[PDB]
Amino acid sequence: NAIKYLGQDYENLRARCLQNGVLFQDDAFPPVSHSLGFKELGPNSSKTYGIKWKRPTELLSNPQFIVDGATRTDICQGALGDCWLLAAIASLTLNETILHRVVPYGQSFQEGYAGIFHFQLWQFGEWVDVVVDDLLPTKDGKLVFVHSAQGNEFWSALLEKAYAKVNGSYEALSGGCTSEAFEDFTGGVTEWYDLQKAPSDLYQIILKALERGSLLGCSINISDIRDLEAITFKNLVRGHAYSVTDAKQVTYQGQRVNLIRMRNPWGEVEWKGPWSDNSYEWNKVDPYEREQLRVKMEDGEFWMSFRDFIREFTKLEICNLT
Ligand SMILES: *[C@H](C(=O)OCC)[C@@H](O)C(=O)N[C@@H](CC=C)C(=O)N[C@@H](CCCNC(=N)N)C(=O)N[C@@H](Cc1c[nH]c2ccccc12)C(N)=O
Ligand SMILES: [Ca+2]
Ligand SMILES: [Ca+2]
């Protein structure tokens, strides 16, 4: 059994709120500016000024904790520099077992609802249960930070809030290391690869990692400072964490081509080179591979050849589960 962060007891708090006819408000991470941040999201900042804390049950008639699965499309970054955390959550969803350790089953906005949710994280050398109230930062009725493509879905928003909580505030999340998020979801072992020095068996390493349900993400280090833009010529975002979500081989004009699939945690802004959703390359693979693999959609997720991936990106991080 997970130990209670700060002694806060999810089921006890929930049953007591329901008995008392109230919705939970979290003393440990209250719905006030200090839970947003301290500087950029401080009490005297532009960003903070627009923000009102509202429950999904105040936003919508039918809020849902999970809709059509807890899946990577549910992870669409908002106005916070927490790409590294969101990339890890999207990777997490590909491993159903570790997903539902972090995201306990049986949580909802209907029967037993008392405005409190909980998540489990690997923190302080312990698996910890973390509670949150479901007050969320909103502006003009819309979530400011993470949201799902499914606008009535709230699990990822609540998980991001619980992760903010353990780190002190949402602002505390602005900038970080994907592998740090991977570890907090697994207690696993992280390693990283310098892609300009990729071992010759790197594609097999990625294949095996994905098969065992390890978490993988990737990034392009901005080397000069940002002095060729943040967005590259072929629509990649530098210094930005992407989730690695698949690796598959296609037969391209009778020749095997190793592909890798990645996802921008923005849920949009995709690679425009070979194997991108609209690329010609797909005209030349057999129709069955093309239909299994290519999804023509602005969803943040796209394919690159492994060759192009290693030239464009600089760093792969892999968290292996023990
Ligand atoms: C995530 C993102 O939201 O993209 C925007 C939509 C992205 O900003 C991000 O966090 N990227 C990180 C890795 C993902 C690929 C990344 O490249 N760097 C952060 C981790 C480095 C941690 N610091 C360290 N090891 N010393 C990062 O940028 N961290 C901070 C940078 C920083 C450090 N000191 C600073 C002083 C002044 C200004 C910035 C400073 C940060 N807070 O951004
Ligand atoms: Ca979903
Ligand atoms: Ca796409």
Side-chain angles (χ1 to χ4, degrees):
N1 266 200
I3 63 175
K4 299 166 178 24
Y5 183 53
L6 306 178
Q8 295 184 107
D9 183 334
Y10 169 73
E11 186 44 43
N12 192 255
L13 290 170
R14 199 204 57 95
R16 291 180 50 238
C17 283
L18 278 167
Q19 189 190 18
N20 290 164
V22 304
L23 300 182
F24 182 61
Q25 296 179 76
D26 187 3
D27 281 345
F29 202 54
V32 291
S33 52
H34 289 143
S35 299
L36 296 172
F38 47 97
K39 173 150 169 66
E40 299 213 290
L41 285 165
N44 305 125
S45 63
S46 306
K47 290 174 169 87
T48 303
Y49 291 153
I51 290 174
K52 298 171 176 183
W53 294 80
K54 301 193 170 145
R55 303 179 192 263
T57 44
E58 309 173 308
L59 288 175
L60 299 173
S61 67
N62 188 48
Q64 290 289 136
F65 189 66
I66 287 154
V67 322
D68 297 307
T71 77
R72 63 199 184 282
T73 51
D74 309 343
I75 313 302
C76 296
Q77 168 166 358
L80 183 63
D82 70 337
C83 68
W84 56 281
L85 167 67
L86 301 192
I89 299 173
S91 284
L92 181 56
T93 74
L94 311 155
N95 183 341
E96 195 103 277
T97 288
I98 175 51
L99 165 71
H100 280 298
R101 168 154 93 219
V102 166
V103 186
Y105 272 110
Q107 303 190 67
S108 84
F109 300 91
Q110 296 93 44
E111 177 60 349
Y113 174 78
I116 179 176
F117 291 86
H118 72 124
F119 303 91
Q120 319 212 135
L121 297 174
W122 170 257
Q123 281 300 82
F124 316 120
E126 303 262 31
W127 279 108
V128 309
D129 200 76
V130 179
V131 309
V132 289
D133 72 46
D134 65 346
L135 290 150
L136 287 168
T138 63
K139 178 158 191 331
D140 318 313
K142 288 296 200 269
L143 297 170
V144 180
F145 308 133
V146 84
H147 51 278
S148 181
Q150 319 186 261
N152 68 151
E153 190 170 37
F154 296 90
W155 74 267
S156 59
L158 291 167
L159 172 55
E160 179 192 54
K161 185 182 174 185
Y163 201 94
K165 184 190 179 159
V166 299
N167 286 285
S169 69
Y170 280 103
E171 199 176 345
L173 306 186
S174 165
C177 154
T178 317
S179 273
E180 193 167 316
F182 289 163
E183 296 156 6
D184 297 353
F185 297 139
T186 62
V189 179
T190 47
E191 70 201 359
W192 74 279
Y193 294 86
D194 171 357
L195 301 171
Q196 276 62 66
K197 292 179 187 148
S200 58
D201 72 334
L202 187 59
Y203 193 78
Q204 300 304 134
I205 297 167
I206 290 174
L207 288 172
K208 178 192 176 157
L210 283 168
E211 159 84 304
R212 50 204 241 73
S214 304
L215 317 176
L216 293 78
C218 58
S219 53
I220 304 158
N221 185 54
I222 168 81
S223 276
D224 254 54
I225 217 298
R226 46 210 222 174
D227 276 20
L228 222 91
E229 312 299 76
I231 306 213
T232 77
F233 295 123
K234 305 285 176 293
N235 222 35
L236 298 163
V237 192
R238 296 190 182 92
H240 183 66
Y242 287 74
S243 317
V244 172
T245 67
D246 213 346
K248 294 282 188 281
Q249 294 118 128
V250 288
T251 315
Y252 178 73
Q253 262 151 304
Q255 191 64 53
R256 192 208 347 123
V257 170
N258 295 163
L259 301 187
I260 176 155
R261 192 180 71 183
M262 73 185 62
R263 189 184 178 270
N264 189 341
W266 293 353
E268 59 190 38
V269 186
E270 303 182 23
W271 171 244
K272 281 179 184 309
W275 299 105
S276 62
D277 288 4
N278 298 145
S279 63
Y280 283 140
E281 273 78 16
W282 292 108
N283 293 345
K284 267 38 170 303
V285 311
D286 80 291
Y288 190 62
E289 280 166 357
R290 192 191 310 117
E291 60 190 57
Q292 293 295 284
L293 294 194
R294 191 194 62 186
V295 171
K296 274 188 148 182
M297 198 174 308
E298 178 70 2
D299 50 5
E301 185 156 75
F302 52 85
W303 296 93
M304 293 174 74
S305 69
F306 192 63
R307 150 159 157 60
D308 282 356
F309 168 75
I310 71 171
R311 188 187 63 249
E312 302 279 0
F313 283 80
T314 57
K315 193 182 186 181
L316 170 78
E317 308 184 35
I318 306 193
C319 185
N320 297 121
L321 285 28
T322 300

